[PDB]
């Protein structure tokens, strides 16, 4: 996260770290959506341009974390993966269209003060809150700058941007399965996701019912925090029918 701040304890109890077993290293962010299901970006698991194609046994998820590098004894919980599910129409060849994946845990995780699931949006909450200017919150342990790394989870609040502005910021084709967020050059304020924040959540707090909803997944950006560029996020609600199908089937 560029131009963010240290999270408060328990501020993002749905935060998940995707962790490689060997070598032991951070792979991505992710989020807890139930006691057995974790949501992430497809490119965290499958990205052939970079020779990335993980299997379940390659990976662990670490839940309840605050420190990036410490083993947070008696606080974090480490879970093994039963199965990865990648969206069947995930477009890794072009623009990361439908950049979404689910991971089922081998055993349910116990909730605690530090471990708690985020909500997924219904159609009405998405329609109400997915509006230009409305701010969400992005969290992760990724790099602090494009060109270093945080001691603890970082948090930044960023406004959703008008779709024509998102489109006009890039030569990449933007789809309805994406939205973009970030400040404009003339807005003064800054902030973005960066490398290592992939797969973590973009959340919004509903003013109607007080609950946090995951509207986006950290997907891609041209650099990090560049003037005139924006961060692009998977549109969770647009892909919720797939999410529901996977959970209902498996």
């Amino acid at each position: 996260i560029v131009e963010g701040s240290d999270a408060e304890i328990g501020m993002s109890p749905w935060q998940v770290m995707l962790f490689r077993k060997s070598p032991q290293e951070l792979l991505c962010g992710a989020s807890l959506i139930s006691d057995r299901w974790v949501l992430t970006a497809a490119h965290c698991l499958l990205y052939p341009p970079w020779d990335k194609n993980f299997t379940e046994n390659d990976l662990l998820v670490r839940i309840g974390k605050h420190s990036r590098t410490r083993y947070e004894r008696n606080i974090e919980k480490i879970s093994m993966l039963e199965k990865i599910y990648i969206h069947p129409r995930y477009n890794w060849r072009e623009n990361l269209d439908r950049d979404i994946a689910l991971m089922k845990l081998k055993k349910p995780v116990a909730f605690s003060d530090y471990i708690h699931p985020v909500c997924l949006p219904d159609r009405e909450t998405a329609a109400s809150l997915l509006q230009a200017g409305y701010k969400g919150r992005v969290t992760g342990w990724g790099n602090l700058k494009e060109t270093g790394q945080p001691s603890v989870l970082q948090v930044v609040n960023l406004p959703i941007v008008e779709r024509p502005v998102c489109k006009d910021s890039t030569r990449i084709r933007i789809t309805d399965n994406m939205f973009c967020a970030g400040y404009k050059p003339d807005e003064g304020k800054r902030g973005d996701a960066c490398e290592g924040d992939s797969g973590g959540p973009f959340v919004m707090k509903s003013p109607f019912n007080n609950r946090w909803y995951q509207m986006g997944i950290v997907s891609w950006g041209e650099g990090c925090d560049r003037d005139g560029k924006y961060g692009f996020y998977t549109h969770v609600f647009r892909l919720k029918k797939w999410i529901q199908k996977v959970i209902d089937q498996f």
Partner: peptide, 28 residues
């Protein structure tokens, strides 16, 4: 989950975090 999105150390305690108000103020 019936309890989703309600943080044990914040909403469940009626405690606010230091920047959630910035989000609320943007929901015009």
């Amino acid at each position: 989950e019936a309890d989703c999105g309600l943080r044990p150390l914040f909403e469940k305690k009626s405690l606010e975090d230091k920047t959630e108000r910035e989000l609320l103020e943007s929901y015009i």
